[PDB]
């Protein structure tokens, strides 16, 4: 049995979504320990693939992947037990991350030492984002540079959409705690919404790159907490595309974001994609704990925990 | 004797120079083999420091640095022979690069294995740019994230100005040739000019970050030659601050840039800082050679050569 552990992906924002930029997409993101993945891959005695833990959507994709990889690497039929599943469609990058974790695990069970980028590609993942792919096996803080726009992009709708973008920035995240918040956000509809908001104005695409590459990244690099928070907040309460994500989601997340900005125990707060997960940074975590406990009791958030960044990516060890 | 070789620094552009951005400065740059530095540091028998090769400006700073480092590391008086000096104030980053090269060399002569960032700082270098500091001992292609703007930046003139910025992006440069061009550019006056052009509009600061981080860098990362050139050109013929550098310099460089854009054997061209050095990229270097030879004969450029990127930084070896 191979026992794989992997961090969740928290996303800051999408970058280039205008009708005239050289490239499209591009994502700033970081990895954290909780919520985490823990799965155990081993030989199925009867010779039939199996998947335990996790919801039906990923459960089938897990099986399809393991069926695929079986004949790819000529390995055995494998049972995987997801002991700790990453919350699905909650803004944690669960599908990409689990698939790569289990995939890498099934590889180690065989002989192979797979490349996660080509594995992601094999399994149909990372056709918009390199975030979760990058964050497996590097962890930390990264920004991928998206995809090159073809000559006939002046028209767009290619923003909606194989080749998973490599990280153009990749840094260790400082030893700062991260407060995770489960809001009452929900998870067609958005396909329609996406076309109503995008393509965004060029100025904003540019500005987002500015806040990501000349705000977030240098501050992470230099371990400047104040500078880091100033950039996280400016993205959250000001990022054109982020605002659209927030506004669409509604009061359920907006109230929590606003409360964090108000709260003096919270130095910055963010939404991860659209999914209910928000996250926050604080130099007074003891005060923040009490604030989030207060929020959870009142029923404005479902849950909260502190975690820390993962600067490794996934990790495997052989057990029995 | 320690024999040190170091690459030149070619600069693409300065990034954030507006009155309201989170950070200021920020520089995209690459390292090349020619023009290069080659120096040899050894013990001065008579016990008096000495500097041969190079112009009077760096010659004294070389000595001051070696005097400084002598009592810092309690080492011997050292003679340095600059066998191949980097052209001074020509847009090659000669001062920073030589100082760090010779400094690192004098260190190896002693016992120490110096950090180039703290060495740069010790020698008063890299108070605007991390370009040449970064490019010593990493080489390749990098972008530094500048400096954090203080609360009282709304007013500016802090854009003119110790802590040398670390590289937020650092990548191997692909195996593409680089055509270097010595134009008839010249090298107070610009101190005045700088205040007339800066601070630049915010939109442009943002846009420059966009072309650097979502243009240059991903293309370098993915080794996409067409994408790379599209971004280099957009910076050169469109970069607000770059245009100001070009326009100020005048016909001497402008004519060469325009000729490269016209020339079908040149896929992209750039100015390095303001200094006479321009550089260009081509997928038909054989045709480009003939174009530059033609230019040099007519007297529109002083000289030209092809070189390639350095992906190491400086290098030392012990000789006698
Ligand atoms: O390949 P990744 O970097 O993970 O991201 C790809 C997509 O998945 C994300 O959803 P979410 O964060 O909810 O993850 P999940 O849908 O897989 O649960 C988000 O909607 C991205 O567009
Ligand atoms: O510390 P660096 O990254 O080298 O760059 C610092 C400064 O030096 C450069 O001049 P130039 O490229 O002409 O080099 P030189 O003046 O040292 O010759 C340029 O004017 C930069 O503002
Ligand atoms: Cl804690
Ligand atoms: Cl060549
Ligand atoms: Na707050
Ligand atoms: Na051309």
Residue numbers in the entry:
A (entry chain A), B (entry chain A): 11 to 171, 180 to 205, 209 to 341
Paper text:
Recent work identifying the biosynthetic gene clusters for formycin A 1,11–13 pyrazomycin 2 (also known as pyrazofurin)14,15 and showdomycin 316 has laid the foundation for obtaining an enhanced understanding of two new enzymes (ForT and PyfQ), both of which catalyse C–C bond-forming steps in C-nucleotide biosynthesis. The function of ForT and PyfQ was originally assigned based on their homology to the enzyme (4-(β-d-ribofuranosyl)hydroxybenzene) (RHP) synthase, which mediates a key step in methanopterin biosynthesis. These enzymes all utilize 5′-phosphoribosyl-1′-pyrophosphate (PRPP) and an aromatic carboxylic acid to make the new C–C bond. The liberation of inorganic pyrophosphate and irreversible CO2 release provide the driving force for these reactions. The sequence of ForT is distantly related to homoserine kinase (<20% identity), a member of the GHMP kinase superfamily, although there are regions of strong sequence conservation.
The resulting crystals were soaked in 200 mM of PRPP 4 before data collection at the Diamond Light Source, allowing us to solve the structure of the ForT/PRPP complex to 2.5 Å resolution (ESI†).§ The crystal asymmetric unit contains a ForT monomer with residues 11–171, 180–205 and 209–341 (C-terminus) experimentally located in electron density; we assume that missing residues are located in conformationally disordered regions. The ForT monomer has three antiparallel β-sheets which form the core of the structure. Gel filtration and multi-angle light scattering suggests the enzyme to be a dimer in solution (ESI†), and the 2-fold rotation axis in the crystal does result in one (and only one) plausible dimer that relies on contacts between the helical bundles of each monomer. PRPP is located in the centre of the monomer, remote from the dimer interface. The 5′-phosphate of PRPP sits in a pocket and forms salt bridges with the side chains of Arg-19 and Arg-135; it also interacts with the N-terminus of short helix in the helical bundle. Hydrogen bonds are also observed between the 5′-phosphate and the side chains of Thr-106, Ser-139, Ser-142 and the backbone NH of Ser-142. The pyrophosphate moiety sits in different pocket and also makes a salt bridge with Arg-19. The pyrophosphate is hydrogen bonded to all seven backbone amides in a tight turn comprising residues His-99 to Ser-104 as well as with the side chain of His-99 and two water molecules. The ribose ring only makes one van der Waals contact with the side chain of Val-294. Informed by the crystal structure, we prepared a series of site-specific ForT variants by mutagenesis (ESI†) and used these variants in ITC measurements (ESI†), which confirmed that Arg-19, Thr-106 and Arg-135 are indeed essential for PRPP binding (ESI†).
